[PDB]
Design a protein around this ligand. Structure first.
Ligand code: HEM
Ligand SMILES: *[C@@H]1O[C@H](CO)[C@@H](O[C@@H]2O[C@H](CO)[C@@H](O)[C@H](O)[C@H]2NC(C)=O)[C@H](O)[C@H]1NC(C)=O
Ligand code: CYN
Ligand code: CA
Ligand code: CA
Length: 336
């Protein structure tokens, strides 16, 4: 039955080329299956590629975007001039060469490199992987990517038009548990957004809820807020979504269980991966994606801070009992 040339077993013949681009990506792009900047840049790329999809523009007679079509690569010349797409050129070129070398569509390649990159980071779920997205695309319309200075109403409207409920917006943001910034405050290049930029865990939701106390760099960058300890960066949209009444209870529910956060994120990502497509027209090659090593650490409020330091914002659910750590306040090293 379907055995690929390397001897692995798969559900369908269309999955066999993906074992070759898996080896190439792990050896080259990911520098030996690491969870470092290439993974974090691909997570920004999959979001910026898939979110260029607007039913409302379609409704007004305009081209609304093809969704998860690989247009950020095929039309990088126009899409990388967009405000939200800075610091992506080097990663886009590396992906372009891999797609051209293996003959796979750009939209599929981005979805595949996201599932593979996440499997290198401890604690990650196994993301679904579908193949078959057409390689033909048109440039994404401008202004469809949420920005860090946007209000929560603006973010929810944009994300809602794409098809996500407020809960799913919070779920999608679990990707900032493997994140840093490079272009908002370049004076503190690669300052992490949570204390474990290499572990897919709940720390991001916990730490954005702590009182902003520290300015991590010499001045404040675009859309920068005070953070809870040296080296951590906090952006305004994350601070505001953590505290807004429309998203606060879902944000709070993501703090205590890595297992719940991961299933929620996996479901929201599978929805995002087929924006602009019919998933029933695609082939499932999820079995090509390897398992990530498990994360054995429990959620904690870092460095001696307690529940008295988190600004509880969900009025109906008491904040979950999370462990405390005995120590001085941490100072975070740049994300690798
Ligand atoms: C809801 C709106 C969101 C906003 C406003 C937002 C905004 C940003 C900004 C401004 C940065 C810093 C980039 C830099 O200066 O280098 C960032 C980083 C990042 N974002 Fe988002 N983000 C959002 C949602 C998401 C989603 C849904 C994902 C993907 C599933 C994502 C994944 C990442 C990752 C992994 C990084 C880190 C990149 C790195 O370390 O180089 N973001 N985001
Ligand atoms: C997907 O479409 C893109 C064009 O949008 C193709 O990319 C070009 O590929 C040729 C070689 O085949 C390169 O010399 C060009 O530089 C590429 N252009 C861009 C903008 O990347 C790509 O080959 C197509 N892939 C498949 C499998 O059809
Ligand atoms: C994140 N963009
Ligand atoms: Ca796109
Ligand atoms: Ca983390």
């Amino acid at each position: 039955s379907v055995t690929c040339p390397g001897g692995q077993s798969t559900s369908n013949s269309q999955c066999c080329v993906w074992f070759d681009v898996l080896d190439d990506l792990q050896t080259n792009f990911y520098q030996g299956s690491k969870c470092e900047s290439p993974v974090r840049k691909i997570l920004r790329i999959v979001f910026h590629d898939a979110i260029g999809f607007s039913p409302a523009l379609t409704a007004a007679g305009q081209f609304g975007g093809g969704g998860a079509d690989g247009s950020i690569i095929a039309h990088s010349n126009i899409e990388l001039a967009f405000p939200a797409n800075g610091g992506l050129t080097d990663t886009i070129e590396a992906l372009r060469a891999v797609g051209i070398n293996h003959g796979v569509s750009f939209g599929d390649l981005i979805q595949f490199a996201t599932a593979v990159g996440m499997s290198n980071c401890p604690g990650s779920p196994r993301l679904e992987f579908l193949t078959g997205r057409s390689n033909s695309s048109q440039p994404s319309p401008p202004s469809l990517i949420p920005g860090p200075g946007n209000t929560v109403t603006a973010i929810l409207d944009r994300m809602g038009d794409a098809g996500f409920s407020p809960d799913e917006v919070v779920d999608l943001l679990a990707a900032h548990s493997l994140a840093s910034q490079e272009g908002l405050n370049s004076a503190i290049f690669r300052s992490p957004l949570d204390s474990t930029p290499q572990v897919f865990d709940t720390q991001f939701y916990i730490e954005t809820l702590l009182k902003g106390t520290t300015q991590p760099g010499p001045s404040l960058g675009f859309a920068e807020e005070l953070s809870p300890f040296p080296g951590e960066f906090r952006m305004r949209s994350d601070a505001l979504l953590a505290r807004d009444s429309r998203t606060a209870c879902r944000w709070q529910s993501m703090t205590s269980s890595n297992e719940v956060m991961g299933q929620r994120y996996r479901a929201a990502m599978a929805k995002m991966s087929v924006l602009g497509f019919d998933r029933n027209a695609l082939t499932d090659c999820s079995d090509v994606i390897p398992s990530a090593v498990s994360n054995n650490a429990a959620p904690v409020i870092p460095g001696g801070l307690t529940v008295d330091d988190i600004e509880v914002s969900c009025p109906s659910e008491p904040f979950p009992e999370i462990a405390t750590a005995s120590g001085p306040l941490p100072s975070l090293a740049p994300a690798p």
